[PDB]
Amino acid sequence: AALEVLFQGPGQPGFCIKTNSSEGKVFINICHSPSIPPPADVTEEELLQMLEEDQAGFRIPMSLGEPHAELDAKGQGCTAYDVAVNSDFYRRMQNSDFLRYLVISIAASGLESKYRLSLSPIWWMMKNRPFMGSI
């Protein structure tokens, strides 16, 4: 359901999701750029039907950035991934909890497939820092 887009960037930092793999803490940096294509423009109703017909039927263009190592708040090594979506789509995400969660699920599953990982469903949004890593 993630449609991967190779994008240089940087794009603009957005927010940062803390989860964990079978091997350590993982951070997903949700970023955005105009350069990334938006997904289909669809209404809430249309979207909910698609997810009924096909669980992964709403495809979202996003970059799936290469792993970058970082240190957590207790000085241990961990991985971060930068995932960028379209900037207008980003603004829609900010105004809808279910849409934003859907994107994060699709990103997490995208990274799982690409980097052969398993990620915890129990993630949390980091409240002070929009981005884990440098920029």
Numbering used by the authors: 12 to 146
What does the study report here?
Binder H33 is a small protein binder engineered by ribosome display to bind human interleukin 10. The scaffold was trained using the ribosome display technique to bind human interleukin-10 (IL-10), a cytokine of human innate immunity. Blocking or potentiating IL-10 signalization by artificially evolved non-antibody binders such as H33 could be an important component of the treatment of inflammatory, malignant and autoimmune diseases in which IL-10 plays a role. Therefore, a newly solved structure of H33 will aid in the design of new potent and selective binders.
Crystals of binder H33 display severe diffraction anisotropy. The crystal diffracted anisotropically, and correction of the intensities for diffraction anisotropy was performed. Paired refinement was used to find the optimal anisotropic high-resolution diffraction limit of the data: 3.13–2.47 Å. The A0.5 data were used for final structure refinement. The structure of binder H33 is highly similar to that of binder J61 from the same study. The root mean square deviation calculated on 128 Cα atoms is lower than 1.2 Å. The structure has an unusually high solvent content of 76%. This high solvent content is present in <2% of the crystal structures in the PDB. The solvent content is probably responsible for the low diffraction quality of the crystals. The molecules in the crystal of binder H33 are arranged in tubules perpendicular to the z axis of the crystal lattice.
